[model samples]
Target: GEILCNLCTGLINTLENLLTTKGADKVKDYISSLCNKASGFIATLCTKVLDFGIDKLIQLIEDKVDANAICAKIHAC
Candidate 1:
């Protein structure tokens, strides 16, 4: 689960920048690439959140992009 938080935190930060400067569709190609074109759990998990949680994820960055902030939703604390 630590990795989950790490990845989510990193992606949220990165997406914050992307959404700030570019189009929404650009995130799809760029972010999944961050997962390194996985063949299993990593790929699935990354894209699942991207596919389903993207809008929420963007709102997340809007609120505050932090490990603790994101981890709170994921029950890290």
Candidate 2:
């Protein structure tokens, strides 16, 4: 989790640098590669979250029931 947070922070900082850069030398490709790598990490994190007792949340979302009730179920879960 901490590693994922660090990756997120690094991506944010890199994007901020990209935003502030001039012209075509903006490291956009670098950001794209970073995102490609991050996608794998993100997928791992999501899988772990769902496996770590979030199935109830998933079920509530899949039920297509009331939105507020879904939130309540979310909070309860």
Candidate 3:
């Protein structure tokens, strides 16, 4: 639990910062960059997390706590 929670916590934090300092499109590119780092479940997560899409991710960050949405999403909380 802690392992995923921690990863998601960090992921959400990064998402927040990217959303704040950049644009939604930038996050797409960022995810691509992460994917380029390549391999295994983390990279796969980078791909599949986008299954929810960037627009909704933007909504979640805007409309609710990033951690809550993403924690529930990635952390199984």
TM-score of 2: 0.34
Q: Go through the candidates in order and give each one's C-alpha lDDT.
A: 0.60, 0.40, 0.59
lDDT of 2 by residue, 1-77 (tens): 34444443444344444444354234344534553453464665434333433333334434653433433332311
Name the lDDT of candidate 3.
0.59
Model 1, range 1-73, lDDT digits (tens) per residue?
A: 4545566676667777776666666676675676555466555555555555656656666777564475446
Question: TM-score of every model?
Answer: 0.56, 0.34, 0.58
**lDDT, residue 20, candidate 1:** 61
Candidate 1 residue 49 C-alpha distance from true site, Å: 0.4
Residue 73, model 2, lDDT: 32
Best of the two (1, 3) by lDDT? 1
Per-residue lDDT of model 3, residues 1-77, tens digit only: 34344555555667777766555777767755654553654554555566766556556777775665665674323
Candidate 1: C-alpha RMSD after superposition: 3.6
Error of 1 at 71 (Å): 6.2
